[PDB]
């Protein structure tokens, strides 16, 4: 079975955001258009070590009220992918938006790594 | 002086036609030059799609190194398998077409495939 850590890497990490077609290719490549069009998804364009290190940065509440969330001290390169108003499965269409923002992730397990993308600020 | 990335693109990238496909490709890509290479896999996907695998599922390499990556999606591949009748320099190849996850080893800056490890 896919672990929560693995699922986070598949859905949110892009350690290789280039072109207007990035989100279309990436949402496909990461199996996020298989059953449905996943409507919103963020990719972090940083090293896995740099994102895993967020689990030792600023402790904050998560959106659901758990207290195992962490805010990155630094801004990170992110791509926001959001489905168009016109997008219809199986023809999933996304707008790609590049930003430099703080990320908030939920951390769990041993090793203690991100398992949930909470938000970018 | 051929690079490891260049070597991977020549030996493994074709951006299966027929039972011929392998016989021509193994010869055309210089794999049968110094000896009949026993087994070879050709990935039929774009170079972009295969390079993207270096950012996908980190898995152990068959040699124990940690720099292997498995594709999240199945990709179209051709397994070329040397026959019994195959004798150097007349190398002969059975052509098997599959949709499988691929596993590649990646190296360098930029981080690119340098070794085809496995199909799963
Ligand atoms: Cl980077
Ligand atoms: N997986
Ligand atoms: N996630
Ligand atoms: N804080
Ligand atoms: N969350
Ligand atoms: N920041
Ligand atoms: N798989
Ligand atoms: Pt990037
Ligand atoms: Pt504070
Ligand atoms: Pt800031
Ligand atoms: Pt979660
Ligand atoms: Pt997620
Ligand atoms: Pt959440
Ligand atoms: Pt092909
Ligand atoms: Pt592919
Ligand atoms: Pt998997
Ligand atoms: Pt699979
Ligand atoms: Pt190699
Ligand atoms: Pt090879
Ligand atoms: Pt190998």
UniProtKB/Swiss-Prot annotation, chain A:
<feature type="disulfide bond">
    <location>
        <begin position="62"/>
        <end position="69"/>
    </location>
</feature>
<keyword id="KW-0378">Hydrolase</keyword>
<feature type="binding site">
    <location>
        <position position="10"/>
    </location>
    <ligand>
        <name>substrate</name>
    </ligand>
</feature>
<keyword id="KW-0325">Glycoprotein</keyword>
<keyword id="KW-0255">Endonuclease</keyword>
<dbReference type="GO" id="GO:0003676">
    <property type="term" value="F:nucleic acid binding"/>
</dbReference>
<keyword id="KW-0456">Lyase</keyword>
<feature type="disulfide bond">
    <location>
        <begin position="37"/>
        <end position="92"/>
    </location>
</feature>
<comment type="function">
    <text>Endonuclease that catalyzes the cleavage of RNA on the 3' side of pyrimidine nucleotides. Acts on single-stranded and double-stranded RNA.</text>
</comment>
<keyword id="KW-0964">Secreted</keyword>
<feature type="disulfide bond">
    <location>
        <begin position="23"/>
        <end position="81"/>
    </location>
</feature>
<dbReference type="GO" id="GO:0005576">
    <property type="term" value="C:extracellular region"/>
</dbReference>
<feature type="active site" description="Proton donor">
    <location>
        <position position="116"/>
    </location>
</feature>
<keyword id="KW-0732">Signal</keyword>
<feature type="binding site">
    <location>
        <position position="7"/>
    </location>
    <ligand>
        <name>substrate</name>
    </ligand>
</feature>
<dbReference type="GO" id="GO:0016829">
    <property type="term" value="F:lyase activity"/>
</dbReference>
<comment type="subunit">
    <text>Interacts with and forms tight 1:1 complexes with RNH1. Dimerization of two such complexes may occur. Interaction with RNH1 inhibits this protein. Monomer.</text>
</comment>
<feature type="glycosylation site" description="N-linked (GlcNAc...) asparagine; partial">
    <location>
        <position position="31"/>
    </location>
</feature>
<feature type="binding site">
    <location>
        <begin position="38"/>
        <end position="42"/>
    </location>
    <ligand>
        <name>substrate</name>
    </ligand>
</feature>
<dbReference type="GO" id="GO:0050830">
    <property type="term" value="P:defense response to Gram-positive bacterium"/>
</dbReference>
<feature type="active site" description="Proton acceptor">
    <location>
        <position position="12"/>
    </location>
</feature>
<feature type="glycosylation site" description="N-linked (Glc) (glycation) lysine; in vitro">
    <location>
        <position position="1"/>
    </location>
</feature>
<feature type="binding site">
    <location>
        <position position="82"/>
    </location>
    <ligand>
        <name>substrate</name>
    </ligand>
</feature>
<feature type="glycosylation site" description="N-linked (Glc) (glycation) lysine; in vitro">
    <location>
        <position position="7"/>
    </location>
</feature>
<feature type="glycosylation site" description="N-linked (Glc) (glycation) lysine; in vitro">
    <location>
        <position position="34"/>
    </location>
</feature>
<protein>
    <recommendedName>
        <fullName>Ribonuclease pancreatic</fullName>
        <ecNumber>4.6.1.18</ecNumber>
    </recommendedName>
</protein>
<keyword id="KW-1015">Disulfide bond</keyword>
<dbReference type="GO" id="GO:0004540">
    <property type="term" value="F:RNA nuclease activity"/>
</dbReference>
<dbReference type="GO" id="GO:0004522">
    <property type="term" value="F:ribonuclease A activity"/>
</dbReference>
<keyword id="KW-0971">Glycation</keyword>
<feature type="glycosylation site" description="N-linked (Glc) (glycation) lysine; in vitro">
    <location>
        <position position="38"/>
    </location>
</feature>
<comment type="similarity">
    <text>Belongs to the pancreatic ribonuclease family.</text>
</comment>
<feature type="binding site">
    <location>
        <position position="63"/>
    </location>
    <ligand>
        <name>substrate</name>
    </ligand>
</feature>
<feature type="disulfide bond">
    <location>
        <begin position="55"/>
        <end position="107"/>
    </location>
</feature>
<keyword id="KW-0540">Nuclease</keyword>
